[PDB]
Structure formats: structure tokens, C-alpha cells
Amino acid sequence: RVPNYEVSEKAFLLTQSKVSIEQRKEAAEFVLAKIKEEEMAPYYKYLCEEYLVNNGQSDLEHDEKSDSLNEWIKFDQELYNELCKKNESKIKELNEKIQKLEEDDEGELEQAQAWINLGEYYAQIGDKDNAEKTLGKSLSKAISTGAKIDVMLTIARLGFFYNDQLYVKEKLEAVNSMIEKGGDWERRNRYKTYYGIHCLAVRNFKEAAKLLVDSLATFTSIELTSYESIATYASVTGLFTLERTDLKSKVIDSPELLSLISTTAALQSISSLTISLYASDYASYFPYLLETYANVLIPCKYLNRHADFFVREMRRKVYAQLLESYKTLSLKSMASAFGVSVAFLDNDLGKFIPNKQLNCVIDRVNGIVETNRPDNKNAQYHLLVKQGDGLLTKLQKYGAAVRLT
Amino acid sequence: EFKKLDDKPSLVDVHLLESKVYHKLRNLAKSKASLTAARTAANSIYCPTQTVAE
Amino acid sequence: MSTDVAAAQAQSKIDLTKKKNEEINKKSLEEDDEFEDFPIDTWANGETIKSNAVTQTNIWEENWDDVEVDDDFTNELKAELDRYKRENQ
């Protein structure tokens, strides 16, 4: 249960090769250690299934790659023999003990509880298929509602372990049904953080942002990644989704973030960005951008998909707030503010502008940047009429279909 | 452990230290929560000059 | 399969016996379903259906990507270069 999210998190570092060499190597030593102790040999082999002849592969179990910077992934047949020994042993013994508890008769309580004990072993060794079955028998037999919440969650955690986001997706719909039927708050906190991390992994950061603020105030730690990590997820969602005012009020009215200060590199890079952004310092905004990229997105499982998406959107927001405060800027003045040369700026503005979410134009000959973004009645007009075409269209088709049938 | 065995005039002092701790970490949530505590502890009156000054 | 938003055109229509033959006719009119010619034509299986994250499999939401150029390389070259020019001024 508990060691599992540590392993998964470390392993992720070996999956990439865009992370630092010395950070990947310490992490690799750790993983081997728990391969021995916790039997994580099946997940070691799984990483090789996700490459096929992709960087991070050097395995002696199957094919190997010499363009990888990973070289600490190299299997042995000592690893493999040690596995079959341990697997065979543990399973025979532990099942035998569990079987006698089923024999002793009390249907609701004794049998149901015996069925849970299998699912912890199968979770531990990282097999999704066998875990699901044995924990399915537990849910089928009447047990307390809290337990049912625990066990559905346990299944949904194996989907983040392998990183199959869909696996998490399906199962947590079942939590949302049982959350009110159980009506328990202990585990309500946990739910908000799980479904939070689901939203984090996909492209819906609005939902995440509302769930993850709650996570800070009150935290349950079972089957959830370390609390320094939970602060790092909150700051990401807040900056991306919310704008100056909401964002600002949020990180001054969160004591939890402030009492913790910096404590790991990822947390530091995120927090730095924050201050600069609402405080209107753009000199130092830009080093922090580069820093977040390296130490926040790449290490995280759920934000490495968004590595590029993140930098893209963040340059838009910074620019938006600047454009808000100025009628005009000169390109050279706007460049000096960032700490980037004159030519450097023109490229960046010009990728955002035809897409039209920056809503400004650049007189090149005058060297000014003009801002023609409406906030009047003209702006409201643009929003509304676009939605009203959409009402027409929806009625048109559904109309036509019913008249004919 | 001293909530289970509280009979000490000495825990007014503990409460005050804690409040200072939290103030300088810059959370007011629990800076507030501890100042109330120390004040409750100083209702039964057994405090030195120094203690009330704090 | 589907076209447009999947649920908006899926609920709209179903087969009745009256309509059934008539659809078969429109497909035949075109000549082939046009999805069994495309694999023949590539001479194995595609190569550029995997070109982008949304293109690969439709399970993620849009990310509006089409260039796939990491921006971290270009930004480090920008940061360091403005700084040296200023320093040696």
C-alpha cells in the first residue's frame, strides 16, 4: 500500500532521460533495494514493455539500447532467479493462513476480511489483474461503507502505479457514488485529493484547482504521495487556472504553503514563480520559468505529458496581465523588463498572436506594441453571439431528426 | 502527554512559545489558535510578571 | 463509427427497417466503405497517425499541438545570451 507510490514515483525518473544524470542514478539505487524487499520485480520488467526500443532501455531481460543514458536499468538473471524464489515462497504460505480464516465460519465478517488480505499482497507486487479479483470478492460480501471506499480507492491507486490514467478514471466514478452513501468525512478528504491527481494527469486543471485547495487544509496520507508533493500540485493548478486577483488571495489565505516555506527543489521553483507573477516583477519571472520546467514537470508522472503545454500557457498569462496594465509598451522596454534581448521577444509574441488569445498587434516601424483587447460592451457581444449560433445549430439538427421520424 | 496530566502552572509558558513559533513561520491560523490557548491557561491566575508581559 | 461530437450524432439516428436498405445503397453508391482502401494504399499500415499525441489515440483532451517543438532549449539560449552582451557592455 504505502511503499508503492514511492517506487512508482522513482521509477518515472528512469522512464525519462531528460532529468539530471545524478538524480536518476540515486533514484535507480533506491528502486533495486525495494525490488528485493517489496518484490517490485514485475513492474521492473513492465517499464521495458512501455519503451519498445526507446531511450531509458538497457535491460538484459530483453533488448537493449546504447543511445540510452540509463545504464542502471540493466537487469540480471540473478534478478529473475531471486524473483521466482521469492514469489513462489510468499504466496504459498500467506494464502494457506487466509484459507483457514474462510473455513471458520462467519460470512459477513470473517470471510470478507480474509478476501482483503490477498489484495494487499497482489497490490504490493504490482499485478493489477489478480488484485482486482480478490478485492472484488470482498466488496460483493456486505462490509462497512468506509471499507468499501478504502478498497475501491486501492484498486484506483494501481492505475496510477502503472500510469494508465483511464484505469484511475473508471474506478473513481464508483467512489463518487459511494461517497455520500457512506457519508463519511475521514475519507472524503482522501477522495478530493485522488480525483484531484486524476484531473492533474489530464488536461482538466480547473477541476483540480478547486479540489486541491481543500487538500492543503486537511490531509489524510494513506495511499497518497508525500505532502511536500501535494503543495507542489496546488501551486501548479492555481497559476495555470486563476488570474491575478483570485490567485493572489489564495496564496496569502493559505497558511499551509507559507508555514512550509521551501523544502525541496520542486517546491522552491514553483513558489518563486508565484511571488513574481502577482507582485509584478518580470526580471526574475523569467529564471523561474526555466526552473519549474526542469524540477517540476519532468519529475512528476502527471505533469510530464504537459511539460510543453505548461510553458506555452504560462507565457500567455504573464503577457496578459502586462497588457492589461499598459495601453502601449515599447518592445525594447518590454524586453528589458524580462531580461531578454530585443529580437528574442518578437518570436514569442508572434506564435500567440494569430491564435488570438493575446489580443494585441505590433507596429514594428513605431516599435510599439498596441492593445486592442475589448473589455467593454463590444467584448460581451463577441461572447454572446457565438453561444447563440450554437443554440440554433443544436435545435436545427435535433428539430429536423424528430420531424422526419 | 501533559494534557493528560495537567496541574501545572507551567504550561502557560509552553503555550506562549508556540504562538511565537507560528508567528515567525507566518501563519496566523495557528498563531491565533495558540494565543487563545495561553490566555485560557492564564484564567486561573498563577503567573509571574514576566509571563503576563509575554 | 462516429462523426462530429460522438453523442450528438449518435442519439440523433438509429436504423429502422424502412431506412435500413437505403443506407446500404448510399455506401455502395460511393463504392466501398473507404477505410479498407486506405490500408492497401499505404502498403502496410500508416506512419503518420502517431504524429501527435491526440492523433495517436483519442483519450486525452486537446492540447492544440501540431509543431511538437520543446521550448526549453530555445529559452536557455535566449537567457544566457542577453546576459553576456550586457555584462561585456
Side-chain angles (χ1 to χ4, degrees), chain A residues 18 165-166 169 202-204 286 290 293 306 308-309 311-312 315 335-336 339-341 344 347-348 351 397-398 401 405, chain C residues 8-9 12-13 16 53 59-65 68-73 75-79 81-83 85-86:
Chain A
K18 188 168 169 199
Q165 306 177 19
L166 289 68
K169 195 179 277 192
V202 300
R203 285 79 185 133
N204 293 286
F286 184 74
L290 309 166
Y293 199 109
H306 305 141
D308 189 284
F309 183 49
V311 60
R312 214 179 57 127
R315 292 178 287 199
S336 279
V340 302
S341 203
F344 294 147
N347 301 301
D348 292 302
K351 285 183 290 190
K397 56 170 156 185
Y398 298 161
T405 54
Chain C
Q9 307 289 305
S12 198
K13 302 283 154 200
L16 285 58
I59 30 189
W60 303 141
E61 305 50 57
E62 190 62 60
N63 289 99
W64 205 267
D65 286 291
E68 317 206 287
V69 187
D70 280 303
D71 284 318
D72 190 18
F73 291 124
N75 292 340
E76 184 189 51
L77 294 164
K78 291 172 177 171
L81 189 51
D82 193 46
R83 190 179 62 231
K85 301 169 59 54
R86 298 186 167 179

Side-chain angles (χ1 to χ4, degrees), chain C residues 20-56:
Chain C
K20 200 181 310 83
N21 204 319
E22 310 195 331
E23 300 164 279
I24 305 298
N25 291 325
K26 301 180 282 184
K27 180 177 57 197
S28 297
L29 187 62
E30 318 293 303
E31 194 52 88
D32 297 319
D33 61 89
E34 309 184 343
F35 203 55
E36 277 280 290
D37 187 57
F38 282 81
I40 303 168
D41 297 351
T42 57
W43 293 109
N45 290 306
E47 41 167 289
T48 42
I49 54 169
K50 318 188 178 305
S51 56
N52 281 102
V54 280
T55 301
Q56 159 68 276

Side-chain angles (χ1 to χ4, degrees), chain A residues 188-353:
Chain A
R188 193 176 297 306
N189 296 105
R190 296 170 54 208
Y191 169 59
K192 289 179 167 191
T193 306
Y194 257 85
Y195 210 77
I197 294 164
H198 167 86
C199 300
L200 193 88
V202 300
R203 285 79 185 133
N204 293 286
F205 282 134
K206 308 192 196 307
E207 189 57 58
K210 306 176 182 62
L211 296 173
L212 288 166
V213 62
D214 302 324
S215 307
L216 294 207
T218 303
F219 194 60
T220 290
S221 66
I222 39 157
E223 310 200 352
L224 285 167
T225 192
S226 198
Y227 194 56
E228 312 187 315
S229 306
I230 308 283
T232 293
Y233 304 168
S235 284
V236 167
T237 43
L239 295 163
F240 189 116
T241 56
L242 311 179
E243 298 303 302
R244 202 274 187 155
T245 300
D246 313 306
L247 166 67
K248 179 177 183 167
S249 41
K250 200 180 64 65
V251 289
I252 290 183
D253 294 354
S254 173
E256 311 289 288
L257 189 53
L258 295 167
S259 52
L260 181 60
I261 67 171
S262 286
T263 48
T264 181
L267 188 53
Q268 190 172 252
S269 294
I270 208 72
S271 44
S272 287
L273 191 59
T274 314
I275 301 300
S276 48
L277 188 58
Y278 64 88
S280 326
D281 169 59
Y282 315 85
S284 305
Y285 177 61
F286 184 74
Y288 316 148
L289 197 40
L290 309 166
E291 280 191 54
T292 49
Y293 199 109
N295 292 104
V296 187
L297 309 156
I298 331 194
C300 189
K301 297 204 297 303
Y302 310 108
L303 291 165
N304 186 76
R305 317 299 164 185
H306 305 141
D308 189 284
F309 183 49
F310 196 75
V311 60
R312 214 179 57 127
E313 289 301 309
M314 290 301 308
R315 292 178 287 199
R316 299 177 197 270
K317 306 303 171 294
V318 71
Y319 291 142
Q321 300 173 42
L322 187 56
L323 291 161
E324 188 89 69
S325 298
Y326 283 66
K327 190 184 195 71
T328 50
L329 288 151
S330 277
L331 279 162
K332 296 186 171 48
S333 189
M334 185 183 182
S336 279
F338 304 112
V340 302
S341 203
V342 180
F344 294 147
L345 176 54
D346 296 290
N347 301 301
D348 292 302
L349 294 171
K351 285 183 290 190
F352 306 143
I353 290 164

Side-chain angles (χ1 to χ4, degrees), chain A residues 5-51:
Chain A
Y5 36 92
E6 305 191 48
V7 156
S8 51
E9 189 71 88
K10 294 307 167 183
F12 184 84
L13 298 167
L14 306 162
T15 320
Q16 299 287 105
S17 288
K18 188 168 169 199
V19 297
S20 311
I21 300 153
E22 285 50 79
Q23 191 180 123
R24 189 175 72 257
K25 182 187 111 279
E26 291 181 49
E29 298 309 294
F30 314 147
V31 180
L32 297 155
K34 291 184 306 194
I35 282 171
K36 295 285 197 183
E37 286 291 274
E38 310 279 346
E39 189 166 322
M40 299 293 180
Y43 178 42
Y44 198 49
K45 318 184 194 170
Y46 196 71
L47 302 179
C48 190
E49 300 293 301
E50 304 171 15
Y51 293 134

Side-chain angles (χ1 to χ4, degrees), chain A residues 122-123 126-136 155 158 162 167:
Chain A
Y122 282 120
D127 296 291
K128 299 199 306 196
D129 196 39
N130 295 140
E132 192 176 71
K133 303 311 184 273
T134 56
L135 298 168
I155 294 180
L158 293 155
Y162 270 6
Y167 200 85

